[PDB]
Design an enzyme around this catalytic site. Structure first.
Site, PDB file in Angstrom:
ATOM      1  N   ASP A  33       0.871  -1.168   0.000  1.00 21.66           N
ATOM      2  CA  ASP A  33       0.000   0.000   0.000  1.00 21.66           C
ATOM      3  C   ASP A  33       0.907   1.217   0.000  1.00 21.66           C
ATOM      4  O   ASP A  33       1.962   1.170   0.652  1.00 21.66           O
ATOM      5  CB  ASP A  33      -0.926  -0.021   1.220  1.00 21.66           C
ATOM      6  CG  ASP A  33      -2.133   0.892   1.074  1.00 21.66           C
ATOM      7  OD1 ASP A  33      -2.056   1.882   0.330  1.00 21.66           O
ATOM      8  OD2 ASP A  33      -3.169   0.621   1.721  1.00 21.66           O
ATOM      9  N   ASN A  81      -3.580   3.029 -12.604  1.00 26.39           N
ATOM     10  CA  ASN A  81      -3.799   1.659 -12.161  1.00 26.39           C
ATOM     11  C   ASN A  81      -4.340   0.767 -13.257  1.00 26.39           C
ATOM     12  O   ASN A  81      -4.195  -0.459 -13.164  1.00 26.39           O
ATOM     13  CB  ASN A  81      -4.779   1.631 -10.979  1.00 26.39           C
ATOM     14  CG  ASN A  81      -4.113   1.211  -9.690  1.00 26.39           C
ATOM     15  OD1 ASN A  81      -2.913   0.929  -9.664  1.00 26.39           O
ATOM     16  ND2 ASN A  81      -4.884   1.155  -8.612  1.00 26.39           N
ATOM     17  N   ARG A  90     -11.728  -4.068  -8.905  1.00 28.62           N
ATOM     18  CA  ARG A  90     -12.139  -3.403 -10.143  1.00 28.62           C
ATOM     19  C   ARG A  90     -11.635  -4.180 -11.349  1.00 28.62           C
ATOM     20  O   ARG A  90     -10.462  -4.575 -11.385  1.00 28.62           O
ATOM     21  CB  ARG A  90     -11.617  -1.957 -10.192  1.00 28.62           C
ATOM     22  CG  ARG A  90     -12.565  -0.943  -9.595  1.00 28.62           C
ATOM     23  CD  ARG A  90     -12.434  -0.896  -8.086  1.00 28.62           C
ATOM     24  NE  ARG A  90     -13.661  -0.442  -7.431  1.00 28.62           N
ATOM     25  CZ  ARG A  90     -13.678   0.216  -6.279  1.00 28.62           C
ATOM     26  NH1 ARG A  90     -12.559   0.510  -5.640  1.00 28.62           N
ATOM     27  NH2 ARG A  90     -14.843   0.604  -5.770  1.00 28.62           N
ATOM     28  N   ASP A 101     -14.510 -11.548  -9.425  1.00 29.74           N
ATOM     29  CA  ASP A 101     -15.863 -11.040  -9.275  1.00 29.74           C
ATOM     30  C   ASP A 101     -16.105  -9.806 -10.123  1.00 29.74           C
ATOM     31  O   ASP A 101     -17.250  -9.401 -10.295  1.00 29.74           O
ATOM     32  CB  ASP A 101     -16.174 -10.697  -7.811  1.00 29.74           C
ATOM     33  CG  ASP A 101     -17.649 -10.450  -7.585  1.00 29.74           C
ATOM     34  OD1 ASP A 101     -18.468 -11.347  -7.903  1.00 29.74           O
ATOM     35  OD2 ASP A 101     -18.003  -9.344  -7.132  1.00 29.74           O
ATOM     36  N   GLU A 133     -17.595  -5.285 -17.944  1.00 27.95           N
ATOM     37  CA  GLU A 133     -18.747  -5.957 -17.353  1.00 27.95           C
ATOM     38  C   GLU A 133     -20.048  -5.178 -17.512  1.00 27.95           C
ATOM     39  O   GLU A 133     -21.114  -5.801 -17.493  1.00 27.95           O
ATOM     40  CB  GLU A 133     -18.498  -6.237 -15.868  1.00 27.95           C
ATOM     41  CG  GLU A 133     -18.444  -5.007 -14.994  1.00 27.95           C
ATOM     42  CD  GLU A 133     -18.314  -5.344 -13.524  1.00 27.95           C
ATOM     43  OE1 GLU A 133     -17.195  -5.634 -13.086  1.00 27.95           O
ATOM     44  OE2 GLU A 133     -19.322  -5.328 -12.797  1.00 27.95           O
ATOM     45  N   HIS A 167     -20.044  -9.754 -10.108  1.00 30.22           N
ATOM     46  CA  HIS A 167     -20.026  -8.581  -9.235  1.00 30.22           C
ATOM     47  C   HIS A 167     -20.967  -8.758  -8.041  1.00 30.22           C
ATOM     48  O   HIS A 167     -21.731  -7.862  -7.683  1.00 30.22           O
ATOM     49  CB  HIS A 167     -20.372  -7.317 -10.029  1.00 30.22           C
ATOM     50  CG  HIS A 167     -19.861  -6.057  -9.406  1.00 30.22           C
ATOM     51  ND1 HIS A 167     -18.877  -5.285  -9.985  1.00 30.22           N
ATOM     52  CD2 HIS A 167     -20.194  -5.435  -8.252  1.00 30.22           C
ATOM     53  CE1 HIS A 167     -18.621  -4.247  -9.214  1.00 30.22           C
ATOM     54  NE2 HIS A 167     -19.410  -4.311  -8.158  1.00 30.22           N
TER      55      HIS A 167
END
Lengths: 276, 324, 321, 284
Positions: D141, D174, D197, D221, D226, D258
């Site tokens: 992080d 990202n 994401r 997920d 999507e 999702h």
């Protein structure tokens, strides 16, 4: 209109004019004054002819060809990347004794199809002895036919016609096909015949006890019916939920006829309205 | 002490190979398919019997020539999987099974066809969840539809015999035969008029990718294509595009270009790596089988009996009948 | 010579390598019964799996080949006529401890698949149905989870459940770990949202989860069984499941599994009356007794089997019966 | 005043009563799930916590702040445990009577290096679960270095982690963070998990890493592209998306639409909170 489906609204929408929801389960179910049946005191009743027999003779063969060639099995094996053809071997219909019970228009058409695949088509009916079939006695059909398909209505003595004893008299390895009525088959005896190996397969479109089950999406629960869960589990069973009518022609016809029938009872509420 | 090993054995085969029907006597069977990792299982056998799932390339043939193998009994009609030229330079005879059951192929073609039109593949998956709703499951009567058969050998004739009993108007194209069971038309008339098209012709170098983008543009909107013949005849990319766009109503396939090492094998550990197979299987207007049109008792019996006949017959004389 | 019945690739990937050359080795994937016992001719060691049946008839045939060692690649000798083998003089040896981490992990996997309704989504998406109705679960956070049986497996499952925010109750008349609020069985039965069994099966245990036990559990509760199928009355479970009293069941074991599990019955389908009804139920999830099926635990089973054969001379073994 | 309604939301929105006004809720893609310029006159009951859109109320512009982070960390592990224990595969085998366990072998998580990217509340909760399974948990992080995680550089997580799970937002830097180069750098056999994401992963390169066998598995997920696909039933057509059909067809992929939020606690909160937020703007 009561038990309305989107496959009816596609045809029943553009042809309805003049005056004027449709929550399923006032036309059919398979307060003006007329009940518009869509099958085949006085409170004015009508009905739909035709109802396409071809769609049911086609389905009959489709379901029977799927079972013998194990298309239900392959479907799930190929989804997994398992292209090994083990357990998907069937037989040539050519030279096999096909047996038709009920020789009305659906039994006849089915015998027409079955004849072209190369089967020797036996058949039984208390009336009419058609040329399409080598008419024989019911017992002879039961015991001699590699394939039996049921195309007759359900009567008080017809119930459970296929039961522990009929299953005993049948040819070992035989396929039993039913798109007629579920009550003609003792599902319990059918499962015991299927499990024990006396009956080589079964291909069903109808099911005694189908009522509250078919035509409805039970996806939130699953299969609570014990017998249905066992039918779907066996590799030598194909089953569809009473969809042998579901063709564009049949539905467009059911829809177009229902509209005319109303158009006949409002042009003259006192009559024979063709299909009373 | 004459030794025959069977590669790519299957239970549906060994149950029909009689006892073994001793062609030669000493018999070993493996389900495993032949390649470099398994060829040494064949040491001591003068006959190696194969299936299409087996690979006999140069390297494998050089290894079989040096074990004393003299016969390659192909349990199939196709010899794609064999480097025939190298095996003829080594002296290994190759023999095949030339005639399946034509009734089995015709019967599967119809099965596969009605499966698609009555949306049985979708019903199968729906009911296993308890979704007995019929939305998405409507088909059409074969009655009155125009069915076009391409290639009019026995397979194509038998396919047209079946379709005529469903009420179909049956068209057919074939420059070398004009049977009475069919209204013989031109290929462009078949392409543009047919509701359902079924292919029953071999693959040629003028045939390759016969069903391409342009062919799909000319076919009738909503049309059904059915392929039990050879996967080369269809451009799969174009087929996938015609199917996602709506132009093509459906496809029912027993064969696939790029099947030459995918079909007949359990890839369960991985899944479907093939880009085209994956998109095909997830499509609601596609039915697909792993080249099983021949997979009936009667046809398998033929294949095994013939292979037994072909080994019994083999004696270094090019009168091997079914030699290549 | 050593013959291996019911060989699997996930097994030969591990004992195959080097395979400390104890004489000549043969492997078949086929399972052992009277139709296949012949393949054991000439062998002095026969190695089995739970898919293999060694009853009286087959032991008298093995004994007559000179087989002197049954190398059971399992913990259970349930499929072996032990008394006949001890009367014939065939030694039997087993693998006593798998990996417990693998059992605990699979328990949680199968639990979270039931609660998050992955089995239903799996089939939904394959049809292109990405509609989330019927797929709602609940947070493990704050739910009361009851673990029955507190050996390493039961402890390792509690260790996991506590990291999901769960209140972990446990019952076990022997030992009271610190990872758990030790309670009485009835308090576990009545208060738990999620129950996971991780105890052996006794003659007083049998059908522990019967109709009465299901009547007493909390409405909507999740039961989980990776231990022994005997502990649950499947009929009652099916009834509790179809009625709504039981929120769901996730099961790795099943009474009457002792000839169905571990074999490919693709040619037929599911002949078992209870299995078909279980699989058709949307609040189930079921696996073929694969809680042990991890590399680490399988490597253990094969190494211990190699150790057992190499150890075999003629004195009572470390893992004899 | 309620749009894009689902029955799992209606179970909870209704008992609490939205209303003694009249509202009516018709589902179609002021009530704004994730599923515009030309807005007419108005008077925003988002029922989400996301930036799918460009008196000072307690939750401001009205979103749901809290949600359930447990729902997603639970789902994250569910998905992840489903793939390592190959429960998708078994699901389809056992339906067929095929109880042979071939190809369902997994690994113990115990002793495996777990790697968490983004160490806010979902990643921290995820690392807590992952810690209990016996894993050695790494984490990366740019802000905050919690003790739940052995904090290391991103490159060290990428290349050393047996298991990676993504729990960070998608930023313009990202996008496509997991691409051909990242896949060359990751450990042979690693599992990748994404409940954050879809855009954080280059699906094409994921499909190639999976097909080539460099990537041991993937558990998703979320999926870039999507949008018009997820939360909708496409049963009549099939799967038209080429990448989804390929993802679903691999044995070492688990995918869910999702659904990592779909828990009763999460939806009751989103429902109760939405109602509270409207009751706060009418008392301004």
């Amino acid at each position: 209109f009561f038990s309305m489906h989107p496959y009816e609204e596609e045809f029943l929408g553009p042809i309805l004019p003049s005056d004027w929801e449709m929550t399923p389960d006032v036309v059919s179910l398979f307060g003006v004054g007329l009940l518009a049946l869509r099958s085949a005191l006085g409170i004015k009743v009508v009905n739909v002819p035709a109802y396409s027999q071809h769609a049911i003779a086609d389905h009959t063969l489709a379901i029977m060809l799927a079972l013998i060639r194990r298309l239900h099995r392959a479907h799930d094996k190929v989804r997994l990347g398992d292209f090994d053809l083990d357990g998907l071997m069937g037989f040539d219909l050519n030279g096999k004794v096909a047996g038709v019970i009920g020789l009305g228009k659906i039994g006849r058409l089915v015998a027409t199809r079955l004849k072209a695949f190369g089967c020797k088509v036996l058949g039984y009916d208390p009336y009419i002895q058609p040329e399409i079939v080598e008419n024989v006695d019911l017992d002879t059909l039961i015991t001699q036919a590699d394939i039996i398909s049921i195309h007759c209505p359900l009567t008080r003595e017809n119930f459970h016609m296929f039961n522990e004893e009929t299953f005993k008299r049948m040819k070992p390895g035989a396929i039993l096909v039913n798109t007629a009525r579920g009550g003609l088959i003792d599902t319990k005896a059918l499962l015991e015949a299927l499990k024990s190996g006396k009956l080589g397969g079964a291909a069903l479109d109808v099911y005694e006890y189908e009522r509250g089950l078919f035509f409805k999406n039970h996806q939130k629960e699953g299969i609570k019916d014990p017998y249905l869960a066992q039918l779907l589990g066996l590799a030598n069973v194909v089953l569809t939920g009473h969809q042998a009518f579901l063709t564009r022609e049949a539905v467009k016809n059911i829809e177009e006829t229902t509209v005319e029938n109303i158009l006949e009872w409002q042009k003259n509420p006192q009559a024979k309205l063709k299909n009373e």
